[PDB]
Amino acid sequence: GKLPPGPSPLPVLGNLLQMDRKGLLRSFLRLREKYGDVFTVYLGSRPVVVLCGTDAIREALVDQAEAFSGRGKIAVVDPIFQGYGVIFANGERWRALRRFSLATMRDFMGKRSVEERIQEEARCLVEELRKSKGALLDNTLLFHSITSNIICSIVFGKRFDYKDPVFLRLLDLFFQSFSLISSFSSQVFELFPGFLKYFPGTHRQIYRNLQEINTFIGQSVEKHRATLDPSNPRDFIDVYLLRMEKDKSDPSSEFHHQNLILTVLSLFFAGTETTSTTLRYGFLLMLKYPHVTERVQKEIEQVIGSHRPPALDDRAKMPYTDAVIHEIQRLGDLIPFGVPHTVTKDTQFRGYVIPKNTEVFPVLSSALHDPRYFETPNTFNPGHFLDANGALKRNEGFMPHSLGKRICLGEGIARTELFLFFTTILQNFSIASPVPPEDIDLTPRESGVGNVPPSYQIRFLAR
Numbered sequence: 357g358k359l360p361p362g363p364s365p366l367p368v369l370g371n372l373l374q375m376d377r378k379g380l381l382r383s384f385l386r387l388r389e390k391y392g393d394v395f396t397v398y399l400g401s402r403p404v405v406v407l408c409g410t411d412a413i414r415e416a417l418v419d420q421a422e423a424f425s426g427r428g429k430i431a432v433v434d435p436i437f438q439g440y441g442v443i444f445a446n447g448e449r450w451r452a453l454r455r456f457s458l459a460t461m462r463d464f465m466g467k468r469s470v471e472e473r474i475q476e477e478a479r480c481l482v483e484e485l486r487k488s489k490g491a492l493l494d495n496t497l498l499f500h501s502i503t504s505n506i507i508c509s510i511v512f513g514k515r516f517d518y519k520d521p522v523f524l525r526l527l528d529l530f531f532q533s534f535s536l537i538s539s540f541s542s543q544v545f546e547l548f549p550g551f552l553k554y555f556p557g558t559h560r561q562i563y564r565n566l567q568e569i570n571t572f573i574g575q576s577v578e579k580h581r582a583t584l585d586p587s588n589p590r591d592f593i594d595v596y597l598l599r600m601e602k603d604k605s606d607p608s609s610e611f612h613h614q615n616l617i618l619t620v621l622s623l624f625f626a627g628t629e630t631t632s633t634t635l636r637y638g639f640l641l642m643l644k645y646p647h648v649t650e651r652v653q654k655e656i657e658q659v660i661g662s663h664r665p666p667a668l669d670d671r672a673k674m675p676y677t678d679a680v681i682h683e684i685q686r687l688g689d690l691i692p693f694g695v696p697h698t699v700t701k702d703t704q705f706r707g708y709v710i711p712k713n714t715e716v717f718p719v720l721s722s723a724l725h726d727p728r729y730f731e732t733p734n735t736f737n738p739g740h741f742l743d744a745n746g747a748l749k750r751n752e753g754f755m756p757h758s759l760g761k762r763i764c765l766g767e768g769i770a771r772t773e774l775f776l777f778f779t780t781i782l783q784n785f786s787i788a789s790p791v792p793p794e795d796i797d798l799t800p801r802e803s804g805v806g807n808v809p810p811s812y813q814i815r816f817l818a819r
């Protein structure tokens with residue numbers, strides 16, 4: 357049959373000349389108004405089926421879950437990952453890695469739970485912020501550090517002190533790669549990769565930094581193997597090393613060294629930046645709307661008090677705080693175009709045929725701003741997640757972690773980090789900044805990865 361409708365492309369530039377300079381998101385919104393919720397666009401010579409609106413996204417990712425469960429390539433990082441690791445794998449390799457990862461992170465190993473690790477990280481964070489004594493800070497580094505430390509706890513069985521210089525050198529290297537992957541020069545590399553990969557550019561810096569991180573990950577794996585107690589696995593690496601030994605004879609097995617290194621690197625890639633940025637965005641909103649922040653603090657005081665630290669069971673009793681977090685994620689809209697998918701076979705969708713391995717973009721932003729589900733889509737409104745009796749309510753438009761078979765693997769971990777970090781910080785500190793609330797601008801910069809909140813200063817004032 358045929359592909360969904362769309363603008364007429366050019367030989368090598370596809371529809372790039374027809375794009376809007378305001379961003380890809382604005383262009384898709386204009387293209388939606390002309391062709392509907394599902395359309396085809398050529399970014400270079402690459403055909404992409406774009407899904408707009410809650411319906412088209414749910415029909416694809418949920419109703420034909422298996423058909424839309426493929427993962428599309430990110431060219432700037434494909435030389436490192438090469439289809440290994442949980443985020444970039446496909447087929448049987450993906451199924452085995454995802455099953456194993458889910459179980460390991462869920463049905464753990466180690467001593468303490470993920471929640472207990474997050475509570476300990478939150479306690480360390482409070483002590484570090486107390487030491488600041490209300491000085492102006494840029495919270496980017498600390499929020500990168502706490503989220504990295506959660507992943508470290510899971511994969512390496514330990515956390516790092518916030519001032520550990522070797523931890524900070526590799527962290528800087530990792531987050532620089534993130535800023536580079538998302539730059540305009542990397543966006544251009546994604547459009548004309550086969551050509552641009554022969555000249556100097558950000559792709560070389562990304563590659564060098566990640567090979568350095570992979571070297572460190574490799575050394576940790578060897579060190580885990582040399583100090584291994586098979587009856588007491590400490591973390592993800594130990595559990596994976598035991599599975600490698602169990603599958604030693606099976607040559608079909610995916611449980612090898614490359615999948616280990618790149619699965620660990622994948623967890624840092626997926627599990628740090630978005631969580632950190634959600635926190636950064638949330639604190640910016642809390643500066644802009646002090647009456648919301650005040651109300652969260654009142655709810656913390658009523659349910660938790662000022663003595664004990666927040667625990668995950670407290671969330672069920674704090675619908676206002678829970679609604680605020682949902683609204684931070686919704687308005688934050690940090691992954692506006694989703695993470696690219698592909699169809700795993702020639703697929704029939706709304707009368708069209710999407711050929712096998714065609715790339716698909718589920719535009720999560722169009723669900724997060726859907727006027728069917730949100731009364732004031734462009735305005736911060738916790739009421740979007742509260743019913744007339746003040747209880748938390750479910751919303752079909754709320755999909756910041758996507759849907760279907762590729763749904764965010766760490767959703768439960770991320771949601772727990774948001775709850776415990778926001779409440780533990782606010783239980784102990786009030787916030788201020790040199791910019792008056794009325795002058796705070798929440799407009800993001802659209803980057804390669806997603807929406808980047810502006811940089812800002814903040815004070816954490818002990819209570």
Ligand code: HEM
Nearest residue numbers: 443626627630631634691695756757758762764765766770
């Ligand atoms: C607020 C924080 C976060 C948000 C909004 C978020 C969002 C997402 C989204 C939109 C996807 C793409 C799903 C798709 O292909 O349709 C994704 C994938 C994924 N996320 Fe998250 N994520 C966050 C935190 C994390 C955390 C903390 C971890 C790990 C501990 C994590 C692990 C993953 C992995 C491994 C995948 C790939 C899933 C797969 O290909 O099977 N995420 N996430």
